[PDB]
Amino acid sequence: HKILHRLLQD
Amino acid sequence: HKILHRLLQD
Amino acid sequence: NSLALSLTADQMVSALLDAEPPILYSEYDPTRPFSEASMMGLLTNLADRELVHMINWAKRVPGFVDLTLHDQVHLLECAWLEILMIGLVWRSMEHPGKLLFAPNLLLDRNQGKCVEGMVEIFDMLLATSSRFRMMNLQGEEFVCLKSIILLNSGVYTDHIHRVLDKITDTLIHLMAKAGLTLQQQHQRLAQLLLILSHIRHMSNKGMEHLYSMKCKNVVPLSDLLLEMLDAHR
Amino acid sequence: SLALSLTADQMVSALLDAEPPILYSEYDPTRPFSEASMMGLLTNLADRELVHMINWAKRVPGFVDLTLHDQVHLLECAWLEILMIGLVWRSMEHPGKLLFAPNLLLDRNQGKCVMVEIFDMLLATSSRFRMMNLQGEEFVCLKSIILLNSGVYTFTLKSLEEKDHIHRVLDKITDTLIHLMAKAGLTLQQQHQRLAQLLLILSHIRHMSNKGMEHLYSMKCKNVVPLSDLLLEMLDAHR
Ligand SMILES: CC(C)=CCn1nc(-c2ccc(O)cc2O)c2cccc(C(F)(F)F)c21
Ligand SMILES: CC(C)=CCn1nc(-c2ccc(O)cc2O)c2cccc(C(F)(F)F)c21
C-alpha cells in the first residue's frame, strides 16, 4: 500500500 | 583521441 | 464515454488553467544554499508540498479521472519529476541564467555547480528555460504540455491516445488563435513536443541523483518521495 | 548549404539512400549461450552497427555542417536511441518479438533479468508503430530527428549559431513529415495528430535509451559481457 493510492482517493 | 572522433573525420 | 473528448478547445484550455496548482514558497530564511544538505533540504521540502498539489491537479486534467486508480498511480509515479521540472523551467523563463524553484528561492549554476548538484542537470534546465523563453511559450501552451507529460510518460506501461489527440487539437487551436500560419503551427508543435524528450532526459538524470541522495542517507526523504523514487527502481 | 534548400521529397530520398545495412548477429542455435551470451551478441552487434551509423549520420542533411566536436556529441547522446528505433522498426511485423538481427529474433521469454521491462517497452513501441502503420519515409525522418535533437541542449557563442542551424534542419524535417502525411491523404487535423503521436514516441525512446545506458554501465562494472573500446568510450561520454 502506497501514499499515492490514498491521496488519489481523497 | 576519441574513436568516434576518428571515425567521423574520414 | 469520457467527457474529456466532448470538451471544446477553449473548454480544455479553461479546464487546464483552472486546474493550475499555485506557485509555492520555500522557507523564509534568507541564506543562499551552497551545500548539498541545505539545497537538497529545500528541494525535498518544496517537492513534497508540490506533490500534493500535483496529485489534485492531475485529477482535474480531463480524461485522467476516467483511468483506473492503478493507472493514475502509474502515470504520476512515472511523470512526477518531469511535471515539477517543466513547472520549474516555466517560472524560470523571465529569469535567464537562474532557476526559480520558488519566488523566494532563486538559484544559479554557481550554487548548482556547488555540489553536486547537479550542475549538468542545472544547466539542462537553464537551456530548457531559455528555449521556452525564446519561443515565447504561452501559459495556455504550457498547461497543455504539462498534461501531455502526465498522460504520455507512463502510457507505454486507446483512451489516453484519444485524449492526447484532443490536447494536440487544443495546442493547434491556441497557435491558430495567436495568428500563426499553418506551417508555423506544425513547426511550433514539433518544437514543443521535442522539448518533452529533453524533459524526460532531465527527469531520468534527476531520478538517478535523487536515488544517490537516498543512499547517502544524509538529507532525509519523506515517505511519499521515497515511494515516488521507488517506483522508478 | 544543402539541407535548407532541399525539398520534402529530396529530403526523403536522401534519407532513404543513407539507410544503414541490417547486420547479422553471431547467434548460433547449436550453442548454449548463457544470458550474458545474448547481451554479448547484442553489444557485439551494436558495436558493428555503430560504424555504419556514423556513416549514416554524415549523410543526414545538415549533420556535416557541424563541427566534429558537435557531431561527436550528437552521436554520443543519440546512438542507443537510434539503434533502438531501428530495432523497433524492423520488429513491427514480428508481434511479441524483437528482431535484433535477421538471425536473432527474440520474444520476451529467455532469462535476461527483470532488462525485461526495457524489452517490453521496445515491444510496446514497436507495437505502436505497427498500429499507426508507420511508413519507411516517416521512420527515416524520425531517426534523423533523434540524431539532431537528443544532444542539442547539452553542448560560448557561435556555438549558438550551430544550435540555430540544427533547429532549422529540424524544422525542415517537420515540414517533411507533414508533407508525407498530407501525401497520404490525411486531414490537417490528422496530420497534426499523427505528427504529435510520432514525436511523443521519441520521448519513450529517450526513456528506453536512458534505462539502457544504466544497464550498460552495470555490464561494464560486472565485467562479464565484453564491451568494445568504442562502446566503453560511448558509455564514458554519457557519465
Ligand atoms: C539543481 C538541480 C538540477 C536539481 C534537480 N531537481 N529539481 C527539483 C525540483 C523541485 C521542485 C520544483 O517545483 C521543480 C524541480 O525541478 C528536484 C526534486 C527532487 C530531487 C531533485 C534532484 F534531481 F536534484 F535529485 C530535483
Ligand atoms: C535485451 C534488451 C532489449 C537490451 C537493450 N539493448 N538493445 C540493444 C540493441 C543492439 C542492436 C540493435 O540493432 C538495436 C538495439 O536496441 C543494445 C545495445 C547495447 C546495450 C543494450 C542494453 F545495455 F540496454 F542492454 C542494448
| Structure determination method | X-ray
Ligand 1 pocket, residues with Cβ under 6 angstroms: C 43, 46-47, 50, 84-85, 87-88, 101, 112, 117-118, 121-122, 125, 206, 209-210, 213
d(CA C100, CA C91): 6
Looking at this protein, which amino acid is placed at residue C204?
N
Distance A9 CA to ligand 1 centre (A): 26
| DSSP letter for each residue of chain C | --GGGG--HHHHHHHHHHH-PPPPP--S--PPP-SHHHHHHHHHHHHHHHHHHHHHHHTTSTTGGGS-HHHHHHHHHHHHHHHHHHHHHHHTTTSTTEEEEETTEEEEHHHHSSSSTTHHHHHHHHHHHHHHHHTT--HHHHHHHHHHHHHHTTTT--HHHHHHHHHHHHHHHHHHHTT--HHHHHHHHHHHHHHHHHHHHHHHHHHHHHHHHHHH--S---HHHHHHHHTT-
> What are the beta bridge partners of residue C100?
C106
**Residue in the block written with cell 501531455:** C148
Whether D170 and D66 have beta carbons less than 8 Å apart is answered as no
The domain total for chain C is 1
Residue with cell 556547488: C114
Q: C195: buried, middle or exposed (CB in 10 Å: 19+, 13-18, 0-12)? A: buried
- Centroid of ligand 2 to alpha carbon of D213 (angstroms): 9
Say which CATH number the domain at C196 has. Answer: 1.10.565.10
Give the CA radius of gyration of chain D: 18
Q: Kindly state the helix (H) or strand (E) to which residue D231 belongs, with its residue range.
A: helix D229-238
Q: Are C88 and C169 in contact (CB under 8 A)?
A: no
| Chain D contact present for C191, CB below 8 A | yes
Strand partners, D107: D97
Supply angle C-alpha D206, D37, D114, rounded to 5. Answer: 50
Q: Return the H-helix or E-strand segment holding D98.
A: strand D97-101
Buried b or exposed e, range C38-71, using 16+ CB within 10 angstroms: ebbbbbbebbbebbeebbebbbebbbbebbeeeb
Exposed / middle / buried, residue C83 (Cβ in 10 Å: 0-12, 13-18, 19+): buried
Q: Which residue has the cell 544532444?
A: D151
Q: Grid coordinates representing D126?
A: 514497436
Q: Are C113 and C107 in contact (CB under 8 A)?
A: no
Does an H or E element contain D204, and which? Answer: helix D188-222
Residue C201 sits in which domain range?
A: 1-233
Q: Which residues of D touch B10 (CB under 8 A)?
A: none
Rounded CA separation B8/D112 (Å) = 33
CA terminus-to-terminus distance, chain D: 34
| Chains A, C: CB pairs < 8 Å | 24
Distance, C-alpha D59 to centroid of its chain: 15
Give the 3-state secondary structure of residue D1: coil
Chain A residues within an 8 Å CB radius of C227: 2-4
Interface test with D, best of C75, C130, C156, C189 (most D CBs within 10 A): C156
